[PDB]
């Protein structure tokens, strides 16, 4: 399936950094340009729904106009926006029939850590605590394993089209990982995707594979007769993975356990805006309130957006002797700001 991109332009604080954040799109092929000025773009990132997201940054914003141009396969028009608690571990594989053909990136709590691409094949730390704690001879086995997993992924991608019927551009995505709930319980997940749709889903309790398509069923029967593999998959997810997760935490206990609160700002243009800048961890709740209850009709949430400092920012808007106030909860720690009356 094809997913049209969602883009939002904003600033790192209220001299600034101009952020262009494009998310929830597929195929991953896209072009992001700031207007035109040089804009450093981040690495391609993956989400749990098989979509993608990207943050391009470069803006005192005084007596001038800024915008962001985006080109994608679901767009006839190259759209330009004018400015105006469970810890977890995830690993993503991106195959391509063509930017690179193969991409591998790790994520702990939605934080980039490991990166491997098929152009220059190496495993580099995306986090400072990774490079510091992990011996250089570590990354060395994994450029080696990854080169194999790359080739193995290419073979499975060829086999899939041929199995499916098409040629040309197609995507193959794998997701594996485990997560640790606050109470101490754990779970694990393994899934494959073809062209951005769920392909195969592994159940570790039943030691079986779930096929969502007649064609995905062929591969099912192939892996299920492998019953020792599955047995191996179970142990990794259930045991080996969790260990890996807990190891990185001890490493990244500094960054992951820090907390900075939001500085809330309110504005109006009819419509009332509430922006929360530079907060962490990502978990937060914003809603408008009217005397004094929460508002529902004509409300718009902007989800959570990366600030670029590793911090984040979100917003909530509402279309209009009543008092309108903005309720934010970070540490929880309820915060309220009266905007208007």
């Amino acid at each position: 399936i094809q997913r049209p991109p969602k883009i939002q332009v904003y600033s790192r604080h209220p001299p600034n950094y101009l952020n262009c954040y494009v998310y929830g799109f597929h195929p991953p092929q896209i072009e992001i340009d700031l207007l035109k000025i040089k804009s450093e773009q981040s690495d391609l990132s993956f989400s749990k729904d098989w979509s993608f997201y990207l943050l391009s940054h470069a803006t005192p914003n005084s007596k001038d106009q800024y915008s962001c141009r985006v080109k994608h396969v679901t767009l006839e028009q190259p759209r330009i926006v004018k400015w105006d608690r469970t810890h977890s571990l995830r690993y993503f594989r991106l195959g391509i029939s063509e930017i690179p053909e193969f991409i591998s990136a790790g994520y702990v709590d939605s934080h980039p850590i490991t990166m491997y691409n098929s152009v220059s094949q190496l495993k580099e730390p995306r986090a400072l605590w990774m490079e510091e704690n992990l011996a250089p001879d570590h990354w060395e086995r994994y450029t080696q394993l990854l080169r194999g997993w790359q080739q193995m992924f290419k073979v499975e991608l060829k086999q899939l089209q041929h199995h499916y019927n098409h040629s040309g551009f197609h995507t193959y995505q794998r997701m594996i990982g485990c997560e640790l709930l606050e109470d101490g319980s754990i779970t694990g997940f393994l899934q494959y995707a073809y062209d951005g749709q769920d392909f195969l889903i592994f159940n570790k309790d039943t030691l079986s594979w779930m096929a969502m398509d007649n064609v995905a069923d062929i591969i099912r029967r192939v892996w299920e007769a492998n019953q020792h593999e599955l047995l191996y998959q179970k142990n990794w997810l259930e045991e080996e993975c969790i260990a890996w997760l807990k190891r990185f935490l001890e490493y990244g206990k500094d960054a992951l356990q820090r907390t900075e609160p939001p500085k809330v700002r309110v504005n109006h243009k009819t419509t009332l805006y509430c922006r929360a800048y530079g907060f962490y961890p990502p978990e937060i709740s914003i809603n408008w309130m009217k005397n004094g209850e929460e508002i529902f009709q004509d409300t718009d949430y902007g989800g959570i957006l990366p600030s670029g400092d590793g911090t984040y920012q979100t917003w909530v808007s509402v279309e209009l002797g009543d008092i309108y106030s903005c309720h934010v909860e970070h540490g929880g720690v309820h915060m309220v700001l009266q905007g208007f009356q």
Partner: antibody, heavy 108, light 115 residues
């Protein structure tokens, strides 16, 4: 880091023998048992991951992940069973760590 | 099919350069070389995870390797040493783990280096 197992064991034909294998590594994916006849190339016997017992033919293997202990249990020994049994276990990374085999000498 | 390994025996004077050839008929991506000595388990000299990449093993010293085909993995030593006397094994796996994958060993190569 380390994997251990007896150097030589002697048993008469027809009896039942057990080869203990104890290992301590950084991580655990699977445990391997290979048979290597004298003057030959090892062959694959059995592979264990989840705690429990694995029986194939008159050969059987068991695995304890907590205790880091696994044994090889051979019922009804024939003369052909005399060989060096190699115990190997995969590291945290996928490299394989081999223990020096247990040479089984079958008494006719 | 099987794994073909040559030669099965060798005798070299120290300082000699000789290569060992290994062939895999099983359509395997992963290829290995082992050195087996009495009193100690198999020690991996070098490996080809897949065609075109090869990484040093536990004991890379004194050995150098190459992937010619996808099917062929040849072990080389350009200088023979007395401490290099051993029984050298080649093996192939379908992929680097993939943790259940068993190794398939070759017949073996008996090497003896003398002054």
């Amino acid at each position: 880091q380390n994997i251990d197992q007896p150097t030589e064991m002697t048993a008469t034909e027809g009896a039942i023998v057990q080869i203990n294998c104890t290992y301590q590594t950084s991580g655990f994916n699977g445990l391997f048992w290979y048979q290597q006849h004298a003057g030959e190339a090892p062959t694959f016997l059995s592979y264990n991951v989840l705690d429990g017992l694995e029986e194939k033919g008159r050969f059987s293997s068991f695995l304890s992940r907590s205790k880091g202990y696994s044994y090889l249990l051979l019922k009804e020994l024939q003369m052909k069973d005399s060989a060096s049994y190699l115990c190997a276990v995969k590291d945290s990374n996928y490299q394989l760590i081999w223990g020096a085999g247990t040479k089984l000498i079958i008494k006719p | 099919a099987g794994v073909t390994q040559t030669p099965k025996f060798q005798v070299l004077k120290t300082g000699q350069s000789m290569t060992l050839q290994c062939a895999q008929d099983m359509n395997h991506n992963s290829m290995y070389w082992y050195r087996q000595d009495p009193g100690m388990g198999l020690r991996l000299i070098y490996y080809s995870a897949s065609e075109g990449t090869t990484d040093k093993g536990e004991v890379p010293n004194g050995y150098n390797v190459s992937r010619l085909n996808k099917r062929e993995f040849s072990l080389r030593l350009e200088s023979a040493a007395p401490s290099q006397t051993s029984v050298y094994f080649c093996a192939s796996s379908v992929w680097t783990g993939e943790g259940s994958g068993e190794l398939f060993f070759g017949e073996g190569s008996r090497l003896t280096v003398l002054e």
